[PDB]
C-alpha cells in the first residue's frame, strides 16, 4: 500500500504524427535518427514540430519571414519553417533567402526564386546541415486563428473583451440589456 496519485502519470504529448502520408513518415524517420543520435537540440525541436498538428504549425507569411531575417547578425542563414510559407501581397521588395519548409505556395515560390533565393526541403537540409548549424528557426503566429478571439474570460463579464458566438452581427441581435447602460446594466 503506497499513496501515490495516478491521475497525472500518463503524459499526453505526441509521439508520432497522426497523419498517414508516407513522405512525412520518411522525414520523421530521418529526423528520429538525427535527433536520437546527434546531440543537437535543433533536431529535437524539428522532430517535435513535425509531430504537431495542422493548427500547431500555422503558416508563416513572407513579410514576417523577411522582417525576422532583417534582424542584425542573422545574415546569410537558412530559414527553417515546419509549416507553410505563404505569399504576402502587400510587400514589394523581397530579398534573396534560403528557406526550408514542408510546403511553399506557388506565388511565394515564384517570388522567392525570382529574387535569387533558394528553396530546400528537410531531406536536403539534413544533407546540407545535419546538425542545423547556421539556421534560424521560425514559426507562424500560433494565436492567429479566429478561435482565440472567443477564448478567455466569458462575454457579459466585467473587463472582458471576448467575441461572443452570434449567428449574425447587427443592430437588433445583441448590444441590448446586458450591454447598454440604458437597458438594465452593462459590463
Amino acid at each position: 500500500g503506497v499513496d501515490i496519485r495516478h491521475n497525472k502519470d500518463r503524459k499526453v504529448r505526441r509521439k508520432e504524427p497522426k497523419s498517414q502520408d508516407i513522405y512525412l513518415r520518411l522525414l520523421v524517420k530521418l529526423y528520429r535518427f538525427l535527433a536520437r543520435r546527434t546531440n543537437s537540440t535543433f533536431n529535437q525541436v524539428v522532430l517535435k514540430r513535425l509531430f504537431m498538428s495542422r493548427t500547431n504549425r500555422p503558416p508563416l507569411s513572407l513579410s514576417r519571414m523577411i522582417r525576422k531575417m532583417k534582424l542584425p547578425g542573422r545574415e546569410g542563414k537558412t530559414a527553417v519553417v515546419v509549416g507553410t510559407i505563404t505569399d504576402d501581397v502587400r510587400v514589394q521588395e523581397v530579398p534573396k533567402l534560403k528557406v526550408c519548409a514542408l510546403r511553399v505556395s506557388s506565388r511565394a515560390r515564384s517570388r522567392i526564386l525570382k529574387a535569387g533565393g533558394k528553396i530546400l526541403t528537410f531531406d536536403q537540409l539534413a544533407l546540407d546541415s545535419p546538425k542545423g548549424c547556421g539556421t534560424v528557426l521560425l514559426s507562424g503566429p500560433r494565436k492567429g486563428r479566429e478561435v482565440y478571439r472567443h477564448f478567455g474570460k466569458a462575454p457579459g463579464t466585467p473587463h472582458s473583451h471576448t467575441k461572443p458566438y452570434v449567428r449574425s452581427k447587427g443592430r437588433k441581435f445583441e448590444r441590448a440589456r446586458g450591454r447598454r447602460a440604458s437597458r438594465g446594466y452593462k459590463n
Binding site: Y165, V166, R167
Partner: protein, 53 residues
Amino acid sequence: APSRNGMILKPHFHKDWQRRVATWFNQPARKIRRRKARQARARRIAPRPASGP
C-alpha cells in the same frame, strides 16, 4: 438547454417539414431531358441560331 457558450439557434423545423421534403435524385435525369429537348429544338430550326433571337 444551453451549455457553456453555444450559439443561440432557432431552427425552422417546428412545422411538419418531413411531409414536404424535396429530393434531387431527379437532377441528372432533368439535365439529360433538357439537353435532349435543346438538341431537338436546335435541329428543328436547321440554319437559325440555337440560342434564339
